[PDB]
Amino acid sequence: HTLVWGVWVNGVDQGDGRNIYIRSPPNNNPVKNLTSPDMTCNVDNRVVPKSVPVNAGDTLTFEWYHNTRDDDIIASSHHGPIAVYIAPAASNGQGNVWVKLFEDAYNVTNSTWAVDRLITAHGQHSVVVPHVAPGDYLFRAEIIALHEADSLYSQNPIRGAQFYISCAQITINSSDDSTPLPAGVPFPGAYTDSTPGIQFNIYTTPATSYVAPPPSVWSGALGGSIAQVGDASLE
Numbered sequence: 001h002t003l004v005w006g007v008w009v010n011g012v013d014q015g016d017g018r019n020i021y022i023r024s025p026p027n028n029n030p031v032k033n034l035t036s037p038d039m040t041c042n043v044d045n046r047v048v049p050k051s052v053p054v055n056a057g058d059t060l061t062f063e064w065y066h067n068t069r070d071d072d073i074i075a076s077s078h079h080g081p082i083a084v085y086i087a088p089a090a091s092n093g094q095g096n097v098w099v100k101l102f103e104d105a106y107n108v109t110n111s112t113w114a115v116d117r118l119i120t121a122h123g124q125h126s127v128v129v130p131h132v133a134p135g136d137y138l139f140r141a142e143i144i145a146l147h148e149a150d151s152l153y154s155q156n157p158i159r160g161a162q163f164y165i166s167c168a169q170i171t172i173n174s175s176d177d178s179t180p181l182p183a184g185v186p187f188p189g190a191y192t193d194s195t196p197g198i199q200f201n202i203y204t205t206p207a208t209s210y211v212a213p214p215p216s217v218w219s220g221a222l223g224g225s226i227a228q229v230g231d232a233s234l235e
Protein backbone atom coordinates (compact mmCIF):
# COMPACT_ATOMS: atom_id res chain seq x y z
CA HIS A 1 0.00 0.00 0.00
CA THR A 2 1.85 3.03 -1.34
CA LEU A 3 1.21 6.22 -3.39
CA VAL A 4 3.29 8.92 -5.19
CA TRP A 5 3.63 12.22 -3.30
CA GLY A 6 5.40 14.12 -6.10
CA VAL A 7 8.53 14.25 -8.24
CA TRP A 8 11.98 15.82 -8.17
CA VAL A 9 13.73 17.16 -11.28
CA ASN A 10 17.55 17.18 -11.15
CA GLY A 11 17.33 16.92 -7.34
CA VAL A 12 14.88 19.86 -6.99
CA ASP A 13 11.52 19.01 -5.36
CA GLN A 14 8.56 20.00 -7.63
CA GLY A 15 6.25 20.09 -4.60
CA ASP A 16 3.20 18.07 -3.62
CA GLY A 17 1.81 16.70 -6.92
CA ARG A 18 -1.18 14.76 -5.61
CA ASN A 19 -4.21 15.40 -7.92
CA ILE A 20 -2.10 18.25 -9.46
CA TYR A 21 0.44 16.58 -11.80
CA ILE A 22 -0.12 13.02 -10.47
CA ARG A 23 -3.38 11.22 -11.50
CA SER A 24 -3.75 10.18 -7.84
CA PRO A 25 -6.26 7.51 -6.82
CA PRO A 26 -8.18 8.21 -3.60
CA ASN A 27 -6.15 5.73 -1.50
CA ASN A 28 -3.18 3.34 -1.54
CA ASN A 29 -5.18 0.17 -2.35
CA PRO A 30 -3.57 -2.06 -4.98
CA VAL A 31 -4.89 -2.78 -8.49
CA LYS A 32 -5.06 -6.57 -9.06
CA ASN A 33 -7.31 -7.11 -12.11
CA LEU A 34 -4.90 -7.49 -15.09
CA THR A 35 -7.70 -6.87 -17.65
CA SER A 36 -9.11 -3.74 -15.92
CA PRO A 37 -8.81 -0.22 -17.33
CA ASP A 38 -7.44 0.51 -13.79
CA MET A 39 -4.11 -1.04 -14.97
CA THR A 40 -3.42 2.07 -17.15
CA CYS A 41 -3.09 4.78 -14.43
CA ASN A 42 -4.99 3.34 -11.43
CA VAL A 43 -8.69 3.90 -10.46
CA ASP A 44 -9.10 7.68 -11.04
CA ASN A 45 -7.50 8.11 -14.47
CA ARG A 46 -8.34 11.66 -15.59
CA VAL A 47 -6.35 14.64 -16.76
CA VAL A 48 -5.04 16.68 -13.78
CA PRO A 49 -4.30 20.39 -14.15
CA LYS A 50 -0.46 20.55 -14.32
CA SER A 51 2.36 18.90 -16.32
CA VAL A 52 5.94 19.11 -14.86
CA PRO A 53 8.49 20.68 -17.19
CA VAL A 54 11.68 18.73 -17.90
CA ASN A 55 14.39 18.49 -20.57
CA ALA A 56 15.96 15.47 -22.21
CA GLY A 57 18.81 14.24 -19.98
CA ASP A 58 17.18 15.45 -16.76
CA THR A 59 16.79 13.16 -13.71
CA LEU A 60 13.06 12.64 -12.91
CA THR A 61 12.59 11.17 -9.43
CA PHE A 62 9.26 9.64 -8.26
CA GLU A 63 8.73 9.87 -4.47
CA TRP A 64 6.40 7.24 -2.89
CA TYR A 65 4.90 7.16 0.66
CA HIS A 66 2.54 4.92 2.65
CA ASN A 67 0.39 7.19 4.89
CA THR A 68 2.47 10.40 5.30
CA ARG A 69 5.45 11.74 3.36
CA ASP A 70 8.83 10.06 4.07
CA ASP A 71 7.31 7.38 6.35
CA ASP A 72 7.94 3.61 6.04
CA ILE A 73 7.07 4.00 2.27
CA ILE A 74 5.58 0.47 1.79
CA ALA A 75 5.32 -2.58 4.08
CA SER A 76 8.57 -4.68 4.02
CA SER A 77 6.36 -7.74 3.16
CA HIS A 78 5.68 -6.26 -0.34
CA HIS A 79 8.86 -7.73 -2.01
CA GLY A 80 8.86 -7.24 -5.79
CA PRO A 81 10.05 -5.34 -8.87
CA ILE A 82 9.74 -1.66 -10.01
CA ALA A 83 9.28 -0.43 -13.60
CA VAL A 84 8.70 2.95 -15.28
CA TYR A 85 7.00 3.36 -18.66
CA ILE A 86 6.40 6.42 -20.90
CA ALA A 87 3.66 7.15 -23.41
CA PRO A 88 2.61 10.25 -25.30
CA ALA A 89 -0.11 12.27 -23.57
CA ALA A 90 -2.29 12.30 -26.80
CA SER A 91 -2.41 8.39 -26.61
CA ASN A 92 -4.04 8.92 -23.09
CA GLY A 93 -2.28 5.57 -22.31
CA GLN A 94 -4.49 3.55 -24.77
CA GLY A 95 -2.89 1.25 -27.44
CA ASN A 96 0.63 -0.40 -27.87
CA VAL A 97 2.29 2.78 -26.53
CA TRP A 98 3.80 2.17 -23.16
CA VAL A 99 7.57 2.05 -23.58
CA LYS A 100 9.69 0.71 -20.69
CA LEU A 101 12.38 3.14 -19.46
CA PHE A 102 13.42 1.22 -16.32
CA GLU A 103 13.35 -2.24 -14.67
CA ASP A 104 14.69 -3.42 -11.33
CA ALA A 105 13.66 -6.76 -9.76
CA TYR A 106 16.25 -8.58 -7.62
CA ASN A 107 19.89 -7.49 -6.95
CA VAL A 108 21.97 -10.67 -6.28
CA THR A 109 24.96 -8.74 -4.79
CA ASN A 110 22.99 -6.89 -2.03
CA SER A 111 20.37 -9.72 -1.86
CA THR A 112 17.57 -7.08 -2.11
CA TRP A 113 14.36 -6.70 -4.10
CA ALA A 114 13.58 -3.34 -5.80
CA VAL A 115 10.93 -2.63 -3.08
CA ASP A 116 13.46 -3.23 -0.26
CA ARG A 117 15.83 -0.69 -1.90
CA LEU A 118 12.90 1.75 -2.40
CA ILE A 119 12.28 1.81 1.39
CA THR A 120 16.01 2.47 1.99
CA ALA A 121 15.81 5.27 -0.68
CA HIS A 122 12.96 7.05 1.30
CA GLY A 123 10.54 6.16 -1.55
CA GLN A 124 12.70 7.68 -4.34
CA HIS A 125 13.51 6.16 -7.74
CA SER A 126 14.54 7.91 -10.96
CA VAL A 127 14.71 7.79 -14.71
CA VAL A 128 16.75 9.94 -17.06
CA VAL A 129 14.40 11.74 -19.50
CA PRO A 130 15.01 10.32 -23.04
CA HIS A 131 15.60 12.28 -26.33
CA VAL A 132 11.99 11.86 -27.57
CA ALA A 133 9.89 14.47 -29.45
CA PRO A 134 9.27 17.61 -27.37
CA GLY A 135 5.69 17.63 -26.01
CA ASP A 136 3.43 16.16 -23.33
CA TYR A 137 3.92 12.66 -21.86
CA LEU A 138 2.63 10.29 -19.16
CA PHE A 139 5.22 8.51 -16.98
CA ARG A 140 3.74 5.36 -15.39
CA ALA A 141 5.59 4.15 -12.30
CA GLU A 142 4.66 0.57 -11.29
CA ILE A 143 5.52 -1.38 -8.14
CA ILE A 144 4.50 -5.11 -8.14
CA ALA A 145 4.17 -6.58 -4.62
CA LEU A 146 4.49 -10.40 -4.82
CA HIS A 147 3.52 -11.49 -1.27
CA GLU A 148 0.19 -13.00 -2.54
CA ALA A 149 1.36 -13.70 -6.14
CA ASP A 150 1.46 -17.52 -5.65
CA SER A 151 -2.24 -17.21 -6.73
CA LEU A 152 -3.76 -15.49 -9.78
CA TYR A 153 -6.41 -12.79 -9.19
CA SER A 154 -8.40 -14.14 -12.17
CA GLN A 155 -8.75 -17.49 -10.28
CA ASN A 156 -8.93 -16.13 -6.67
CA PRO A 157 -9.80 -12.44 -6.34
CA ILE A 158 -8.70 -12.50 -2.63
CA ARG A 159 -5.06 -12.95 -3.75
CA GLY A 160 -2.78 -12.13 -6.72
CA ALA A 161 0.09 -9.84 -7.57
CA GLN A 162 -0.56 -6.30 -6.29
CA PHE A 163 0.08 -3.31 -8.60
CA TYR A 164 0.81 0.15 -7.23
CA ILE A 165 0.49 2.28 -10.37
CA SER A 166 1.00 6.06 -10.59
CA CYS A 167 0.88 8.27 -13.69
CA ALA A 168 2.76 11.62 -13.73
CA GLN A 169 2.04 14.31 -16.38
CA ILE A 170 5.48 15.41 -17.69
CA THR A 171 6.24 18.00 -20.42
CA ILE A 172 9.55 17.56 -22.29
CA ASN A 173 10.64 21.02 -23.58
CA SER A 174 14.23 20.74 -24.82
CA SER A 175 15.04 17.69 -26.80
CA ASP A 176 16.63 17.17 -30.22
CA ASP A 177 14.37 14.14 -30.83
CA SER A 178 17.17 11.82 -31.67
CA THR A 179 15.48 8.72 -30.28
CA PRO A 180 11.88 9.08 -31.38
CA LEU A 181 9.52 7.01 -29.17
CA PRO A 182 9.08 3.45 -30.61
CA ALA A 183 6.13 1.02 -30.29
CA GLY A 184 5.33 -0.18 -26.79
CA VAL A 185 2.72 -2.32 -25.03
CA PRO A 186 -0.88 -1.84 -23.80
CA PHE A 187 -1.98 -1.52 -20.16
CA PRO A 188 -4.22 -3.31 -19.65
CA GLY A 189 -2.99 -6.14 -21.94
CA ALA A 190 0.77 -6.58 -21.62
CA TYR A 191 0.42 -8.64 -18.41
CA THR A 192 -1.55 -11.90 -18.56
CA ASP A 193 -1.81 -14.89 -16.18
CA SER A 194 0.98 -16.67 -18.15
CA THR A 195 3.38 -13.68 -18.29
CA PRO A 196 6.67 -14.38 -16.50
CA GLY A 197 6.81 -12.66 -13.05
CA ILE A 198 3.02 -12.31 -12.53
CA GLN A 199 2.52 -15.69 -10.71
CA PHE A 200 5.57 -16.44 -8.54
CA ASN A 201 6.21 -17.93 -5.09
CA ILE A 202 8.80 -15.70 -3.29
CA TYR A 203 8.75 -18.12 -0.26
CA THR A 204 10.00 -21.27 -2.14
CA THR A 205 11.53 -19.99 -5.46
CA PRO A 206 14.97 -18.35 -5.17
CA ALA A 207 14.79 -14.59 -5.94
CA THR A 208 17.73 -15.17 -8.43
CA SER A 209 15.19 -17.21 -10.54
CA TYR A 210 12.64 -14.33 -10.67
CA VAL A 211 12.09 -12.93 -14.20
CA ALA A 212 10.17 -9.60 -14.28
CA PRO A 213 7.27 -9.21 -16.74
CA PRO A 214 8.29 -8.12 -20.24
CA PRO A 215 8.63 -5.83 -22.14
CA SER A 216 12.43 -5.30 -21.98
CA VAL A 217 13.85 -1.81 -21.34
CA TRP A 218 13.94 0.28 -24.57
CA SER A 219 17.49 0.72 -26.01
CA GLY A 220 16.64 4.52 -26.21
CA ALA A 221 16.34 4.64 -22.36
CA LEU A 222 19.03 6.91 -20.82
CA GLY A 223 19.28 5.38 -17.34
CA GLY A 224 17.65 5.18 -13.93
CA SER A 225 18.16 4.05 -10.29
CA ILE A 226 16.45 3.40 -6.93
CA ALA A 227 18.27 5.91 -4.69
CA GLN A 228 17.46 8.93 -2.55
CA VAL A 229 18.12 12.20 -4.54
CA GLY A 230 16.59 14.70 -2.05
CA ASP A 231 15.86 15.04 1.66
CA ALA A 232 12.11 15.66 2.19
CA SER A 233 12.68 16.54 5.88
CA LEU A 234 14.63 19.78 4.76
CA GLU A 235 11.33 21.49 3.88
Ligand SMILES: Oc1cc(O)c2c(c1)O[C@@]1(c3ccc(O)c(O)c3)Oc3cc(O)c4c(c3[C@@H]2[C@H]1O)O[C@H](c1ccc(O)c(O)c1)[C@H](O)[C@H]4c1c(O)cc(O)c2c1O[C@H](c1ccc(O)c(O)c1)[C@H](O)C2
Pocket residue numbers: 047048049050051088089090091092136137138169170171
Ligand atom coordinates in the same frame (compact mmCIF):
# COMPACT_ATOMS: atom_id res chain seq x y z
O1 LIG B 1 -7.28 26.56 -20.58
C1 LIG B 1 -6.72 25.32 -20.34
C2 LIG B 1 -5.63 24.87 -21.05
C3 LIG B 1 -5.09 23.63 -20.78
O2 LIG B 1 -4.01 23.15 -21.47
C4 LIG B 1 -5.67 22.80 -19.83
C5 LIG B 1 -6.76 23.29 -19.12
C6 LIG B 1 -7.30 24.54 -19.38
O3 LIG B 1 -7.39 22.57 -18.16
C7 LIG B 1 -6.94 21.26 -17.82
C8 LIG B 1 -7.38 20.91 -16.52
C9 LIG B 1 -7.35 19.56 -16.16
C10 LIG B 1 -7.75 19.13 -14.92
C11 LIG B 1 -8.22 20.03 -14.03
O4 LIG B 1 -8.70 19.64 -12.89
C12 LIG B 1 -8.32 21.36 -14.40
O5 LIG B 1 -8.82 22.21 -13.52
C13 LIG B 1 -7.86 21.83 -15.65
O6 LIG B 1 -7.53 20.35 -18.67
C14 LIG B 1 -6.93 19.79 -19.74
C15 LIG B 1 -7.51 18.70 -20.36
C16 LIG B 1 -6.88 18.12 -21.46
O7 LIG B 1 -7.42 16.97 -22.03
C17 LIG B 1 -5.67 18.59 -21.99
C18 LIG B 1 -5.19 19.75 -21.36
C19 LIG B 1 -5.73 20.35 -20.22
C20 LIG B 1 -5.15 21.50 -19.54
C21 LIG B 1 -5.40 21.23 -18.01
O8 LIG B 1 -4.80 22.22 -17.12
O9 LIG B 1 -4.06 20.36 -21.86
C22 LIG B 1 -3.37 19.76 -22.95
C23 LIG B 1 -2.82 20.87 -23.62
C24 LIG B 1 -3.49 22.07 -23.90
C25 LIG B 1 -2.81 23.10 -24.58
C26 LIG B 1 -1.47 22.89 -24.95
O10 LIG B 1 -0.70 23.84 -25.57
C27 LIG B 1 -0.85 21.69 -24.66
O11 LIG B 1 0.45 21.47 -25.01
C28 LIG B 1 -1.52 20.70 -24.00
C29 LIG B 1 -4.15 18.85 -23.92
O12 LIG B 1 -5.06 19.69 -24.63
C30 LIG B 1 -5.02 17.93 -23.13
C31 LIG B 1 -4.42 16.66 -22.74
C32 LIG B 1 -4.75 15.49 -23.47
O13 LIG B 1 -5.54 15.69 -24.59
C33 LIG B 1 -4.29 14.23 -23.17
C34 LIG B 1 -3.52 14.06 -22.02
O14 LIG B 1 -3.03 12.83 -21.68
C35 LIG B 1 -3.10 15.17 -21.24
C36 LIG B 1 -3.59 16.44 -21.59
O15 LIG B 1 -3.22 17.58 -20.94
C37 LIG B 1 -2.35 17.55 -19.74
C38 LIG B 1 -1.62 18.81 -19.62
C39 LIG B 1 -1.78 19.59 -18.48
C40 LIG B 1 -1.07 20.80 -18.27
C41 LIG B 1 -0.22 21.19 -19.28
O16 LIG B 1 0.53 22.31 -19.16
C42 LIG B 1 -0.06 20.43 -20.41
O17 LIG B 1 0.84 20.86 -21.38
C43 LIG B 1 -0.75 19.25 -20.61
C44 LIG B 1 -1.47 16.25 -19.81
O18 LIG B 1 -0.54 16.34 -20.95
C45 LIG B 1 -2.27 14.99 -20.04
Ligand SMILES: *[C@@H]1O[C@H](CO)[C@@H](O)[C@H](O)[C@H]1NC(C)=O
Pocket residue numbers: 033034035036037157
Ligand atom coordinates in the same frame (compact mmCIF):
# COMPACT_ATOMS: atom_id res chain seq x y z
C1 LIG C 1 -11.68 -7.52 -14.24
O1 LIG C 1 -11.86 -6.43 -15.15
C2 LIG C 1 -12.65 -6.76 -16.30
C3 LIG C 1 -12.52 -5.60 -17.32
O2 LIG C 1 -13.09 -4.39 -16.84
C4 LIG C 1 -14.06 -7.05 -15.82
O3 LIG C 1 -14.76 -7.50 -16.96
C5 LIG C 1 -14.02 -8.14 -14.77
O4 LIG C 1 -15.34 -8.17 -14.25
C6 LIG C 1 -13.06 -7.78 -13.62
N1 LIG C 1 -13.01 -8.82 -12.57
C7 LIG C 1 -13.55 -8.63 -11.36
C8 LIG C 1 -13.42 -9.76 -10.42
O5 LIG C 1 -14.12 -7.58 -11.01
Ligand SMILES: [Cl-]
Pocket residue numbers: 030031032033036038
Ligand atom coordinates in the same frame (compact mmCIF):
# COMPACT_ATOMS: atom_id res chain seq x y z
CL1 LIG D 1 -8.41 -4.50 -9.12
Ligand SMILES: [Cl-]
Pocket residue numbers: none
Ligand atom coordinates in the same frame (compact mmCIF):
# COMPACT_ATOMS: atom_id res chain seq x y z
CL1 LIG E 1 -12.20 20.11 -15.35
Ligand SMILES: [Cl-]
Pocket residue numbers: 120121122226227228
Ligand atom coordinates in the same frame (compact mmCIF):
# COMPACT_ATOMS: atom_id res chain seq x y z
CL1 LIG F 1 19.43 5.55 -1.11
Ligand SMILES: [Cl-]
Pocket residue numbers: 056131174175176177
Ligand atom coordinates in the same frame (compact mmCIF):
# COMPACT_ATOMS: atom_id res chain seq x y z
CL1 LIG G 1 18.53 16.75 -26.57
Ligand SMILES: [Cl-]
Pocket residue numbers: 217218219220
Ligand atom coordinates in the same frame (compact mmCIF):
# COMPACT_ATOMS: atom_id res chain seq x y z
CL1 LIG H 1 14.33 -1.70 -27.67
Ligand SMILES: [Cl-]
Pocket residue numbers: 059126127128223224225
Ligand atom coordinates in the same frame (compact mmCIF):
# COMPACT_ATOMS: atom_id res chain seq x y z
CL1 LIG I 1 19.01 7.83 -12.18
Ligand SMILES: [Cu+2]
Pocket residue numbers: 001002030075078145
Ligand atom coordinates in the same frame (compact mmCIF):
# COMPACT_ATOMS: atom_id res chain seq x y z
CU1 LIG J 1 -0.08 -3.16 0.59
